[PDB]
Amino acid sequence: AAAAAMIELDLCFGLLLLILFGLLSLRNGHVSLAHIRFICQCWLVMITPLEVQDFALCILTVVLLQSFHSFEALLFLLLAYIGQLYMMHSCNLVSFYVCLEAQTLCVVVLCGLLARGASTSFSVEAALKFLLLSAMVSGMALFWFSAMYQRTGSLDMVGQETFWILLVMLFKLGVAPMHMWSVDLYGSIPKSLLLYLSTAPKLSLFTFWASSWHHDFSVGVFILFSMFIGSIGAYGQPALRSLFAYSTINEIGLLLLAVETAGFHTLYQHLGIYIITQLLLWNLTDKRLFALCAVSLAGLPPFAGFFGKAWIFWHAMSVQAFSLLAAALFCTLLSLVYYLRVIRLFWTAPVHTAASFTGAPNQTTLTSACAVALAFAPVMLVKPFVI
Amino acid sequence: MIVASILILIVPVLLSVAMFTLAERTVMASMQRRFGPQVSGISGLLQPFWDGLKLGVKEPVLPDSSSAGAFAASPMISFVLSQVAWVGICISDASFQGLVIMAISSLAVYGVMLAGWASNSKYAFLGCLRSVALMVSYELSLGAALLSIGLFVTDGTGMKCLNFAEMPTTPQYAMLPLCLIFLVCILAETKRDPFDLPGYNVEYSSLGFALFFIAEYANMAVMSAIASIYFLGGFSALKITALFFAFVWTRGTLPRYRYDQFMRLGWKAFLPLTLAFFALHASVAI
Amino acid sequence: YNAWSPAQRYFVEGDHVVTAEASRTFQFTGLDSGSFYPYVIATVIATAISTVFIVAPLVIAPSRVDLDKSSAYSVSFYLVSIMYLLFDIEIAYLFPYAMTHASLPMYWTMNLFLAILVAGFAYEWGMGALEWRE
Amino acid sequence: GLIRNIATFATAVVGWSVGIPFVVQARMNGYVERNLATYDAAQRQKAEEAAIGG
Amino acid sequence: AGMGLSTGTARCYDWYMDYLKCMDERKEPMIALRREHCLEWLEDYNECLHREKERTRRQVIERERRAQLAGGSKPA
Amino acid sequence: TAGFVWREVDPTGQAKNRNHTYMYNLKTFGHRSYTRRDPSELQAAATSVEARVKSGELGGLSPLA
Amino acid sequence: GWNALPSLVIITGIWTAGLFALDKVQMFRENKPAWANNKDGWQKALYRRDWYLQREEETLAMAK
Amino acid sequence: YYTEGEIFGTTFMYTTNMMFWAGIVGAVAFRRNLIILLLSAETVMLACNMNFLFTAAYLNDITGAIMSITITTIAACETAIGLALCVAYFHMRSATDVEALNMLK
Amino acid sequence: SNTVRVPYSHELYAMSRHVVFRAEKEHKAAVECKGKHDWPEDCKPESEALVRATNKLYKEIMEKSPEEFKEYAQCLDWYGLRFSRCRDKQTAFEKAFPIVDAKK
Amino acid sequence: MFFENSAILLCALLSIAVGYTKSPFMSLMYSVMLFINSSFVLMMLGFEFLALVNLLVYVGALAVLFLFVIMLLEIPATELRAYSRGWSTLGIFVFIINGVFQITPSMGPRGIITGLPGAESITNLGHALYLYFADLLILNSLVLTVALFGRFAIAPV
């Protein structure tokens, strides 16, 4: 009986109808597609199950779709969402491989498609490098899956070959020293895909890790590499895109410290606060709120980034992971300097914000002003909330 | 015994290719109210042999600006693939024989593209891509036709296959439009009329050129045998001759398409028709 | 290939079976059912014949050196090649369906597969990508 | 030249077809030797545990 | 995922099912603690898979056969 | 499914958490088990077969001479 | 026309004689007129068992 | 000590291991173009596909064949997209680079 | 060791109709034993009984109707064990040797 | 079994040869030889249909796209530092260590395995693809859809 699979049939039927509707709308010469975007958001809601993580991903992708305008980009983001959703439910390396590869192909094509102006060739260059680096990591995953399949005779993810699969997962999160594909991507690709790349796949992969993964090894050297390299790199790079790429490497090192000491509640709290800050960061038009992102990414006390860092520090001290904790505290002391550089650049400066001329007047002030109210979330964060 | 069987197969293939190219000349002449080759031997029966021997003592032109290995390799690859496809027709018992021959005929594209890469002509590079585009475009309709054919091929034990000895010995009346599409696809693969616009062997002389034409006529005979197996209830000598006569008859009476015209035909007419027929036959076969 | 174990020889003992297998004639109704071995021999023999065709006019033909005898006398292909690649993969997927005696849920799964195929194809048709004007 | 390249390819193919099976044979011989050492050590441990384990 | 290539199931599927049944019937709060009590079924499943111990026995018999022909070449 | 799993909470609490791979394989492919035959039955059946051979209602072990 | 008849007759005769000769040769190799049939795993197992038992019958014949 | 089947199996596994590392390393080591890098990625995929098919025959199991079909699909899609991007980048940067498709120079 | 074998595959196909109508109890016992016990040692008497019951039947046919059985088995051998190509030989053999003992 | 083992070992030689040569055309020719030889290797394992899929997809379809791209984009620069710059000794050392000596093999502690031919059943494959792995089949279709749309969007205008 197939009566337990109506959501899958609904997914496929919705894709079949959406392609035909997008074709009919384009035969009329419509230069805007807000109706297509609303149908895409409805389809996103209709295929998502009733778990916390699934709906967090769903609501995140509904918010992200407001920064994309063409039909093909919307289709690629939907088919990347299918991989992102179904990776959280993957209990093998077969589905794991297919979901990861679908996401990689969608990201590569979007990086090629959306570039404009003088930065087109730089974006295509960085997309090619990302594709080549992704191909060999995919080959490593397939090779060691074949080794595990031959040794165990089954699809269980146990044994020594899980160390290389773990390295595949660490590549997909931009963990140093395999971090330079993300550093290349941050310097050229436009802001909407940078917003997409810093939020949704990290959530999808960490939920797969929380749900169906065990390894008998450690990730401590990659924690050290990510934290020290990210902090020193963001201290040393004057371009703002490289600053935010290296600060992202530092944040993924903190999330790996939360993974390594168990306690995924602190991981989920810090990831949620980080995702809301990212949603504020890449949609800013008034540059004074760039200082709020700075004080809430430096871990300064009353804002929500402090709470996200401080439960990670608390659980690390609870299980006595002293050396990694000391390295994390040193890199936190270093991170403050370049977040202060951000504050010097964009707060202690005269205010200029250009008006719109061709309509759409400051079109994402709702989301940015809503996400700035991360100064009111700390009242709920101090309680036993995320567990 | 396998080497003996293969050589005993190879002999009538080459003899038949010589007689096909003579019969094409003479039938094309009879439609045009003339005679065709009659002087060269009694009833002209030595003309292909003297063409082959004339090309044998002809000077081989090796251009000293090309890559000699790929230039030599292109007609060898074409000829070898034609002979191997004939062996797959007659000296095989494989379960997926039609898939084997489809795979071999998909390899035949390489001789055209190696000739296009090797010779340093401006329009050989221009025409090889067009010929490859035509063959590539009609291979998909051939594959979907094979999908429609294989839905009804079952052996005695109940297993579905593409084995030629398990095909029925009666004409497939239910698949007449698919048979017509298959025949026009054969015409498109062999670059005959009305798809003969693209040539690629403009720099070849003597026995490399002879290898090109032997490969072309042998591939035509392969596709004729395949169509007679799939649709006409078996492989026979009379069916080979009748289908060859039909191809020459079409070449006598029709003009050719432009490049974009047969591209639109193959990508907007033949592929949707073969896929729709596959869906209908799958609905019937349940 | 010859069998290397008593279990592979149906537990027949002796030395007559080993020599008889190593010096056997090829037989589709003996030990070599569905074998694909004549395809390799055909390649070797036809390569020999075409090499003899290549080499022979270098001996029995006239030749004259001249500097003029040794001289020369779009994105749609990208579309065709990539579309042919994807459609060939799809037909290869459809082939295990046609080789089975499929039940009704198999039929509806296959039709969902074909529907996704033809939906992408019809989108590229409607946007004017199969009109080969350029 | 063409004859030089065909000769070099034929030489490389024949040399690869004769040389690599010796590498594989040496590797398999090393694995057999280490496995036999492991078997003997396991038998020694079993005898020791039977001796002081009753 | 345990379906056979030419048969209904794989050739060592039932050994795997024996091991998983043993793991199912234990009550320890950790998988690593439950694994210590089902090591015999895991060993039999690994012996189904790769036959390392049968190969080891044949290697030992071959070592003795090569020893009884070099050190012992007794003529009649 | 063969590569995906979905987890939902029992409203009543009367469901036992097991390995979903083991449960999936039990429902999909089953599990075959066997037993060793008791030796007394083996010698009894061997004696009966020997008696059937001797009394003449059983043939030989080969069709040849 | 009458000039096109001899080549068309010769093609048929060539293919008839060649197929007859190839049939006789492969019939001598295989000794049964169903060698080209499709065979599944059960039929392959049956043929391989038959071949090995024929070899065993030959081995046992040269001992009496 | 070992049989002909064991030689055949160990030779297969040694061959595929050297194939995998050849595809991973060699075109980068010889400082080749992006087109040859994509070809070597196809070599990596072929090594994994051969390993899966060998294991599927070895265990009498279906999962290797499923993985084989999936690997062919994903590898061809990624290769086609990469070649399209290579052509676009070459046409964007050939006016000032000449050797634009070689990033290992 | 003793040589144990059953007739050739075309002979087995030619005699397969008599096996269930004349050696049903050996067939039942062999099927039940292989269902219960996996080790080949544990099902040796029933295996031996089924082999001997097949060989005794093969000895019966060659005493009563050898030429009809030989031509039918040769026909099955020639056409790749396809029953649909040897209906006349099958009818002649079953007429010479009935599947069940008629007029009893 | 000399020719079968030699045909198995030839695949690694062709894998090295793809990157070793300086001509891109010759690299593609080596790859075509490798895929044909590997399709014949897969048929030693008993796979008839999947070897034909290997041939039909990789040699028939993908290598044609490779040869079109190479023939459209490669003006001869083999002298232009493709010969004059050589190769990387560190990369060659990595290849030797990992693929010749094989310090981290896929079989791990095991060193000997018995190769066993299979018997491919396409009825089993059809049942598996269209009943047991149907969700993976549909997601493969979605990946092919991504490829088709993405190529047609990325085609240089």
Ligand SMILES: COC1=C(OC)C(=O)C(C/C=C(\C)CC/C=C(\C)CC/C=C(\C)CC/C=C(\C)CCC=C(C)C)=C(C)C1=O
């Ligand atoms: C309008 O279409 C046509 C063309 O344009 C496409 C042509 O170009 C040609 C001319 C080209 C020809 C005939 C070349 C192709 C055929 C060949 C080489 C014949 C092959 C025959 C063989 C191998 C058998 C002959 C050899 C024998 C008998 C061996 C002899 C040995 C001894 C005596 C010892 C023709 C006739 C034609 O109609």
